Assembly symmetry: C2
């Protein structure tokens, strides 16, 4: 119900069958290009390596990447934009054996092959131009 702090930081343990669910709303209209960033970190430090970086420029594109040994690797870009202008969204990131599967409002929207094992993740950070009402880590089978 109530708004969560942004940047939002939560310790997390991920493996095949894990899902990270986020509910939030952009802080600006799509004309002003608000951003959303979700980072799966290897340590409880914001300067640590990033196993999975998911960045939305609302109304424009999605960029996915990893930061290894302090350096950004090969960017994966998607022009798929299921997010709606001025609306609350549900972002769901599922851990599959070979990749992350990203869902937006129940629709399968993005994929990213594992570069580092998801078991290396110790923390999740959610930040940039969003208000956040829900953050949850769940596990199934």
């Amino acid at each position: 119900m109530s708004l969560l702090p942004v940047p939002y930081t939560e310790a997390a343990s991920l493996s095949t069958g894990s899902t990270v669910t986020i509910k939030g709303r952009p802080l600006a209209c799509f004309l002003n290009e608000p951003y959303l960033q979700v980072d799966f970190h290897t340590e409880m430090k914001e300067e640590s390596d990033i196993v999975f970086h998911f960045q939305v420029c609302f109304g424009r594109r999605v960029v996915m990447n990893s930061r290894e040994e302090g350096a950004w690797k090969q960017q994966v870009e998607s022009k798929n934009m299921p997010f709606q202008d001025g609306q609350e969204f549900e972002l769901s990131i599922s851990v599959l054996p070979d990749k992350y599967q990203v869902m937006v409002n129940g629709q399968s929207s993005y994929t990213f092959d594992h570069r580092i094992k998801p078991e290396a993740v110790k923390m999740v950070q959610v930040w940039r131009d969003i208000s956040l009402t829900k953050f949850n880590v769940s596990y199934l089978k």
Copy 2:
């Protein structure tokens, strides 16, 4: 005490006006937090922008204007007086021909007027910062 972010205030600017902002980035420079300051023509976030000032901390500064919903010619600066993990004081002064931007007492950026500063009705401060002070002052 912190101000809400996005921060929006009604403003009237002319030659001799100064917009002072005091704040801190919400992330370390390695994570590239942003700061955006927009001088709008109306009390609407989708309205035209007389002066847009955007910092990508530790990387660059971009300045521009948005007219009839379309961005014009970008002005880029690689000058980065902002310090990693520190509080900053940003001052935007309105001169006859341009905006003069100071960072922590250092003259750092300029932007020639495209539209008269008297067209500004509102100032918006947003992106990855905590804000402790916002003030519009005049001395001329």
